């Protein structure tokens, strides 16, 4: 024999409380839907996984410091060459990657994302080079 929900609102006031809670959650969700600004995948200014075989190798990184050092080390581990285009800023661009099992492509993706608009990372797989492009 089927039993009613143990948490069923069976009070004249509890039912109203539960519908008010439902309405408040619905209104909050609608507010968040209006507020949220999204970037469509076509217009996303972020590094896409370079698909390079040497870059797909898994790694383990615990680094918190300048972007240049970690990017150069990642490139050398991937066996790609490394180059920097631009002038290094006075205050260094500091990043932090703490991962135990993540491929070098994804690590470079995270490095680019944390760099934001101060610097960007491009990967040329045909001529295997990681380029760190600073911004002025």
């Amino acid at each position: 024999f089927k039993k009613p929900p143990i948490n069923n609102p069976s009070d004249d006031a509890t039912i109203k409380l539960a519908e008010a809670a439902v309405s408040v959650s619905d209104s909050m969700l609608e507010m968040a839907k209006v507020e949220k600004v999204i970037t469509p995948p076509s217009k996303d200014n972020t590094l896409t996984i370079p698909n390079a075989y040497n870059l797909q190798a898994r790694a383990s990184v615990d680094w918190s410091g300048p972007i240049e050092e970690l990017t150069a080390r990642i490139a050398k581990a991937a066996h790609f060459r490394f180059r920097v285009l631009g002038k290094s800023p006075s205050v260094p661009v500091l990043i932090s990657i703490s991962t135990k099992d993540e491929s070098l492509a994804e690590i470079l993706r995270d490095i680019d994302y944390q760099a934001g608009k101060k610097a960007s990372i491009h990967v040329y797989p045909n001529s295997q080079v990681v380029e760190l492009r600073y911004a002025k």
């Binding site: 539960a18 809670a21 909050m28 507010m31 968040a32 932090s96």
Partner: protein, 249 residues
């Protein structure tokens, strides 16, 4: 023998002397009743804890930099009779009860609605009207606990409603958003201690109601009619549910 129930309180004992008995019975009954009603109020709040979390979701109202939005209080049709021959009226007054500040955790409903509970241990005109007056004290304590809970509900409603009103006014450009600046130090420290990515966040401008009424933005909602919609048998049909008690005014 039990102080946590009116039955046990009464079973504990199963003009000057009369009045003293009345006063002491009321005093013992009130505290026990207030404690028991606070316990039941807490039990109800814990029963509805998740719904209360959904309703008073202070976390969703938190601004960009983990800043609690200010509390805005609104009144309409304001009038003040200063004296004979002088009144001051205003259509709406908006006030900032509490200003925006940096927070590290969103507020919860327990800080407002929780009722403190401790089981209070305690002990013809001698134990005959004592039960009557301790029942009266029990009812008084229940009423006092209900009043305290009502005030707590009013306080949480004021805070949540003020935050919602701030969001609404910011939508209509009747308040300014809080302006925050980050000072981005590099690697800061000496040979004894370093900090890698040192950043200092500072609210350089608190939100405030703007008096430039030209900059406000009115908002007009609408309801959808049969516009741009319509075999298209648009009909006003009698055949439908008809109320039993039809002409009620």
């Amino acid at each position: 023998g039990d102080t946590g129930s009116l039955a046990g309180l009464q079973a504990m004992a199963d003009k000057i002397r009369e009045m003293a008995l009345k006063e002491t019975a009321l005093s013992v009954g009130a505290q026990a009743g207030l404690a028991w009603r606070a316990k039941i109020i807490d039990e109800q709040l814990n029963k509805q804890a998740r719904n209360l979390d959904a309703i008073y979701d202070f976390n969703s109202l938190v601004l960009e930099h983990n800043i609690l939005p200010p509390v805005l209080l609104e009144g309409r049709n304001t009038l003040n009779l200063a004296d004979a021959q002088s009144i001051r009226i205003s259509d709406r007054t908006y006030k900032v009860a509490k200003q925006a500040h940096f927070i590290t955790t969103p507020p919860t409903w327990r800080q407002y609605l929780w009722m403190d509970y401790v089981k209070p241990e305690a002990p013809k005109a001698e134990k005959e009207i004592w039960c009557i007056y301790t029942e009266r004290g029990w009812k008084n304590g229940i009423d006092q606990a209900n009043t305290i809970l009502e005030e707590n509900i009013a306080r949480i409603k004021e805070d949540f409603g003020g935050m919602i009103l701030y969001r609404k006014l910011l939508a209509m450009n009747m308040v300014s958003p809080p302006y925050v600046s980050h000072t981005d130090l590099g690697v800061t420290g000496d040979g004894s201690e370093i900090h890698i990515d040192d950043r200092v966040l500072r609210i350089t401008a608190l939100p405030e109601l703007n008096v430039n009424s030209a900059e406000w933005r009115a908002a007009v909602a609408k309801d959808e009619n049969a516009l741009e919609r319509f075999q298209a048998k648009i009909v006003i049909t009698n055949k439908s549910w008809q109320p039993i008690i039809a002409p009620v005014s």
